[PDB]
């Protein structure tokens, strides 16, 4: 069978292919080849612009334009030609070199310096810079914008549900109340920390020849400061310079990038699970679309499939991201080639994540808080007032406060009247007694609401 | 950009797409849908053949042929129709049901029992059986055949290199010799163990309604023995029966299946790495063709790129296989849907492995043992004879045998002459002294050759 | 600070030390050394009993008893002596050899064949056999017994709760009912599958010299069939023979063993989580004793801390088990020593699991099903009867059955009365209408109870 | 059997127990209890020092001293008492509370405010701050110093071997030369990046009650600004404040801490492997100790067991660190208790790492570079000069330079005379021809030496 979204082995290009279309122009073989062409061309232009390198005179305006067009117009047809050449070379980057030499052959000025294409370069000089550009593009144009959508989305939920009381669950058991909004706020805050970290991750690049010592460069141009030339070229591409490497850029920054993405994903997994649970408890109703089918056999079903889809894909994302993070930075001696094939999977780990981000956003858009249920549940759990009562008792020196409340509530059902009766028998100033009799599980929410309102201050 | 092998995000469908084409008809959405249709059709066919279920009379030959054709000729166009219907249902299995209902509408016999399609079934009854069929097919038609090629390949190398001496390396250091063939035999033996295990793994399936208690089945047909019905149906598909489940088949067998593939892949990583190193030591030269480029900058390079490609892909395979193996069997209460999207990746872990198997076979085809280097290295490591000498001394009661050889060789360079002189000073019977003076690093290979020759007698 | 359970870095030897005491005599350095001594002693004993090896005459009863005593009475003091000798050798197995040599010196018979201790052996010949003995002992005396307790425990719950109705949850939502007992039975069945698998795993061992070719053995005794000698010795230890290896036993069986324990642990995590949730839903209340504190701040709390402790430890167990399973079988060339230090952790992964098994059993002992809540919840979810109604409608040819019930219940609240009214308007034979009007969420449990009663007939 | 280093199940407390003794006072149950006592006491002191909280008057000098002594003198006997109390409570932190109440009972001033011990606190307020102190102490006093030793060690090797030529290996094959020192320098640089990152990781702490909303605090003291009180207390402990949490501190920073430690460990694994290989190639000899045994059967053996031990333990370390990093940040709703038992393993992942750090240092101390072998090997690989020759040809416009050199060397043995003969036939200016004939694989090292000398500038 020919490849199509229906026949694709992986769901990243298959069932969810339309959810990650932007990655097809970045992490695919086409994307890799596109970026390699960009790097090769930029290298030739720097050599030409470098006065000390007389063998490569400055290019005329039209020659520079011809070169820039090769970069900007790079097509699948161009990539297909490179692969055709690769059939002969069985070496992808050499095929890129030969492809570029073919392209400039018709332009005398360029053909003249044809043998300067890839001059003194090793394949990894081209590959690592290509990977850097792929990752930088992915982060700045795709990943961060989804993270911002998720963060803004959670904040909106926090504000929207700021004052909606919730019977908290610790150890899965009824506990001291909070508000739906506050529980949303906690997640936004965590996501924000990771967003800052991802944005601060360095994206490194290098260019220094075969084993990282500019051997070939120096042999031909011993008078040129290639260490300076290297830093200038890498930074000219918008990449941060990595001065010490072997044949390959070590890949530590890729682990740094993926580790933070995995942390964010983990926070999202936690969120997907919690909401799945709130929906199970009926604290949230789900918006329904006319025509849709919840269950093939149970007509009444309305399921949180978006949160579940996201949860599953986040696990897959982390499995791939984690493997790359831990495996890439280890390479035998000056390097073994196992990282090449692995690096063709940078978009895979990212892709599962993007699919999950969209699913979560989709699930969030269908949330309908159920205040009635939330409040009704709280009204059936007056035992949660045992904490404040004992704490107040502690304040006013009443003996064994915690112990007395434990005797009253642990393993015992106690309603409002019962809790109220206990308070009345306490040796406390009327003012405090009345203050205690005035609280309910629904209003025993502490600083929850204000916590939500102050989030914007962090 | 439209999807093509060039724009595909994953190299399983991209760069290596042509290496795993067989999986496109199995693990993809098209494959999933095709098997779902097969299961649905067979379910309807069993209901018809069941005399006690009179509302669905036995189907005549032409109707059975029409149903069989739906299964056999299932096309991408058919899959597209289901996807079109799914746009409305937002439920894939329900779209399959509607698809089939549309298909039988033109056959009165079949159209008359239209509402019996998916009768009493829950989506997972169809899904789990499809996954089982997908995995069984992949194992018997794809995985095992590659494993047999690797095993036979290693065995061929074992025989071909049965008597070629090798300076063994323990802790990376020169050690007691072996033969290239013996080192290959060890790997083939480990591979065979996993082969037998994978083949013995159970591929389970179930069919029992919404939560596993045949609730719906019994509500409509209380006089029918659905437990028996279930076992017959699952086994009729060539799948092994799993009588106890919630809404989903628990997936334990998937972990069992993936755990053995991972063990096999691990053995292969070990192999890829060892050969990469033997090539690094120049114990093997590499066959290459004119035109091929080793390095873009170093024209003299000839690299073991096939073994490296395999090694990298095996790591990826195991990472995906292991995630599925450990995550799938955990599902909240009667099931949470997180396993659905994950199960659409059964072929991904398998795909990375297939790519690796082919790369290794390619690498193996290019190996050329370098007898000259192997022997020359052995002739510069006569210190390895310290072990046999001390051992012989132990036998004949000579004092501090091991200790004496350690003082003589640890941290010291000793050639054939120096080792010979030492043996001469030993208080051993002439015959034993001669035997020791007759051995060399190259012939101090123990039972290596016979071990290789006897491999065929195992497994 | 001196080491004590209070200062121990790891909770396996610290807080939970008393929960895994049996492992101290197996996987610790003391245990490793004890088994090494056992293997060394048995090796010497076989050499003596082998008539062809005349330099080591058969041992008389008292000498055999003295050797057996070294093995049987091996103490921490003996272990300390070896560690003392190791301070000089910087090689543990060599220290064991010297230890034994010192021990036999007082027995002329044994002292006379002193240099035959460790004869022709490489350290791994002793190590791998010790690991095999450690794992076999742990499996047969520790792991399986806990697994049997869990399985029997789940089966007891299954029987005890066989007929207690439960509103099932799929996607976390109210679904077709089952029984508490049926949900327990499902787990017991999965556990039994892994139990059989773990019991069937092969525990392999080898003994063949420095690199696996009996080089040293053949150099001294070329007329002896060491391949046969090897198989006899390994099997005499109750271990299964692995004829092909490098310096180390490849460790594939360790992965096979650990892969099944991990699958079992995964099933248990699934269980711990489900029960944690059933407790959260108040389907089960928890037994607690006076004096116990649930929360330091919320006096009303009663938490399922036992299940939570188990769940956390199972994750830890699998993480260690999986690392060993995937890393151990890869060793550079004839072996690199990275597996030695790692193999000192065989008991760690097992320890986390043992802690978890005991915590779960403790949690189970405190469960008290809450029939009132389970039934009350079911009585507020009559919408689950939409499935059986539509299914019956399908049987009797009523049009758009599923679709009609969806419009009636999806996103809508429907009580017993509303469901009853709907059934009355259906064009079905009186008998079928009555049957539908007679069912309730609580009795719509299908074959749940019989499934539980038939569990005993499986496995 | 009773617990001893010989009977310990885990080698962290067993065979290598003496290698991690410092962790016994930090991550053990004793350490956890010690820190919990510290937090509880500090909390009581802040309440006393807080003027607005009149029910807890400022403490006299001797009372404060008595409290400080409880913290500073905390012993195993004290910890044993807490565990004895825990037998009754089956709740560790409550046992700590009761233990402290017992300790102050003899001091009237303290006994007077006995019920203010743990006032309004939830166990996790104490636990998370304890974990923060454990991790901060471990990083600043143990981990970073080992990393600094390793970094300084690699730098010393770099300087010591700065000019020692090495036949590089890419794909495991003879490649463009470098120097032993440069290969050491690359590793030091990578380790330094992680050191900076680990040092910059935030160590967070919180204190806000049952579910994070100061519910109990406000119920008793509605006039006190508990949000300010919280930030002050956490920062007073030297911990960074985490304002938004549920019952537990989310643990994201722990993942951040462990992820960077794992990255460092991975770099070290790569190093352990490379040196193991250099030793296998005989580029490094190993120092030998009189009396030691390399092999029980092969008398001549001298093995790099220290690097191997380190490699094995680094893998174990990462397995544990990774599990904690990915599992801890996920907790059901306001929290499930699975993280408590897991957090008792913070020292385990760290312990394996420390054992490995020491083993690597030990292995490094035994390295003896073998210049003779290194140089002899290079002198047998004149084919590596094919790169510079073709590059020079490229510079001077000689047709198909790379192609001509490939024909000459790919799959062919070419010695100095052969390479020299090829150069003589080139149409290049004598000056360049002589420059090429003057190089050897040993001096074709590019900027390697200078790269090493400039490391100190980064
Ligand atoms: N040392 C190297 N650096 C960069 N590319 C290489 C190196 N060695 C081989 N290659 C080529 O890199 C490509 C790797 O392909 P793949 O394994 O599919 O990722 C192959 O086309 C090789 O010919
Ligand atoms: N409980 C369930 N069992 C089987 N399929 C379901 C269930 N709940 C929802 N679905 C459907 O299964 C599909 C899951 O899609 P995906 O997440 O992409 O794997 C969706 O089309 C859902 O409508
Ligand atoms: N090739 C080998 N086979 C078995 N033991 C070895 C080997 N090489 C070194 N050893 C010893 O094995 C022990 C490994 O200790 P450890 O790294 O703590 O597990 C050390 O005492 C070494 O002297
Ligand atoms: N929600 C909670 N927060 C803090 N501690 C708890 C909580 N629930 C139970 N505990 C106690 O925490 C301890 C956990 O012990 P372990 O599982 O061994 O780490 C037990 O002593 C419990 O009684
Ligand atoms: O193609 C390169 O740039 C390098 C190849 C190699 O080192 O083998
Ligand atoms: O589609 C089904 O078969 C089941 C759906 C559900 O349980 O929600
Ligand atoms: O101690 C041994 O048995 C082997 C040691 C080695 O191969 O180095
Ligand atoms: O002990 C505590 O602080 C909290 C306990 C709980 O939430 O259950």
Summarize this structure as a short list of keywords or feature phrases.
homotetramer, 458 residues, mainly alpha, Fumarase C, Chain B, domain 1, Ribonucleotide Reductase Protein R1, domain 1, 3 domains, two-stranded parallel ribbon, 6 strands, 5% strand, binds adenosine monophosphate, binds fumaric acid, purine biosynthesis (chains B, C)
How would you characterize the overall build of this protein?
The structure is a homotetramer. Chain A contains 19 helices and 6 strands. With 458 residues, chain A is mostly helical. The first copy, chain A, folds into 3 domains: 1-117, Fumarase/aspartase (N-terminal domain) (Fumarase C, Chain B, domain 1, Orthogonal Bundle), CATH 1.10.275.10; 118-381 and 446-458, Fumarase C, Chain A, domain 2, CATH 1.20.200; 382-445, Ribonucleotide Reductase Protein R1, domain 1. Chain A has a two-stranded antiparallel ribbon with strand order 1-2. In chain A, strands 3-4 form a two-stranded parallel ribbon. In chain A, helix 6 (123-160) runs parallel beside helix 13 (346-364), helix 10 (252-280) runs antiparallel to helix 11 (305-327) and helix 11 (305-327) runs antiparallel to helix 13. Chains in contact: A-B, A-C, A-D, B-C, B-D, C-D. At the A-D interface, strand 1, strand 2, helix 7, helix 8 and helix 10 of A face strand 1, strand 2, helix 7, helix 8 and helix 10 of D. One adenosine monophosphate (AMP) sits between chains C (90-93, 123-124, 337, 340-341, 344) and D (15, 303, 305, 309). Chains B, C: Keywords: Acetylation, Lyase, Purine biosynthesis. Chains B, C: AMP binds at residues 15-16, 90-92, 247, 309, 335, 340-344.
């Amino acid at each position: 069978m020919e490849l199509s979204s229906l026949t694709a082995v992986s769901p990243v290009d298959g069932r969810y292919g339309d959810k990650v279309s932007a990655l097809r122009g970045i992490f695919s073989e086409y994307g890799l080849l596109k970026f390699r062409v960009q790097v090769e061309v930029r290298w030739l232009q720097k050599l030409a612009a470098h006065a000390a390198i007389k063998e490569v005179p400055a290019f005329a305006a039209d020659a520079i334009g011809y070169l820039d067009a090769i970069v900007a117009s790079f097509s699948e047809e161009d990539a297909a030609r490179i692969k055709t050449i690769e059939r002969t070379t069985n070496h992808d980057v050499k095929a890129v070199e030969y492809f570029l030499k073919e392209k400039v052959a018709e332009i005398p000025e360029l053909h003249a310096v044809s043998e300067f294409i890839h001059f003194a370069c090793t394949s990894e000089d081209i590959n690592n810079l290509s990977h850097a550009l792929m990752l930088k593009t992915a982060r700045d144009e795709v990943i961060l914008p989804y993270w911002r959508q998720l963060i803004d989305g959670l904040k909106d939920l926090a504000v929207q549900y700021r004052d909606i009381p919730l019977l908290s669950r610790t150890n899965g058991q009824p506990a001291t109340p909070s508000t739906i909004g506050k529980e949303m706020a906690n997640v936004a805050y965590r996501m924000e920390r990771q967003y800052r970290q991802l944005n601060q991750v360095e994206i490194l690049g290098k260019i220094n020849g075969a084993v990282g010592n500019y051997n070939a460069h120096i042999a031909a141009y011993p008078e040129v400061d290639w260490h300076q030339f290297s830093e200038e070229f890498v930074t000219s591409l918008g990449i941060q310079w990595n001065p010490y490497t072997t044949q390959i850029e070590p890949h530590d920054y890729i682990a740094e990038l993926f580790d933070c993405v995995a942390r964010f994903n983990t926070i999202l997994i936690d969120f997907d699970r919690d909401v799945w649970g709130y929906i199970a408890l009926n604290h949230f109703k789900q918006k329904t679309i006319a025509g849709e089918i919840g269950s093939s056999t149970m007509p009444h079903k309305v399921n949180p499939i978006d949160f579940e889809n996201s949860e599953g894909n986040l696990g897959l994302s982390n499995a791939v991201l984690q493997h790359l993070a831990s495996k890439l930075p280890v390479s035998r001696w000056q390097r073994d080639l196992t990282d090449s094939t692995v690096l063709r999977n940078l978009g895979v780990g990212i892709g599962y994540a993007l699919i999950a981000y969209q699913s979560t956003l989709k699930g969030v858009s269908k949330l309908e808080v159920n205040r009635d249920h939330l409040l009704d549940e709280l009204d059936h759990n007056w035992e949660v007032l045992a904490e404040p009562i004992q704490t107040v008792m502690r304040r006013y020196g009443i003996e064994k406060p915690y112990e007395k409340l434990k005797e009253l509530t642990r393993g015992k059902r106690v309603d409002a009247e019962g809790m109220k009766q206990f308070i009345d028998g306490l040796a406390l100033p009327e003012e405090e007694k009345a203050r205690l009799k005035a609280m309910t599980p629904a209003n025993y929410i502490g600083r929850a609401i204000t916590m939500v309102d102050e989030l914007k201050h962090h």
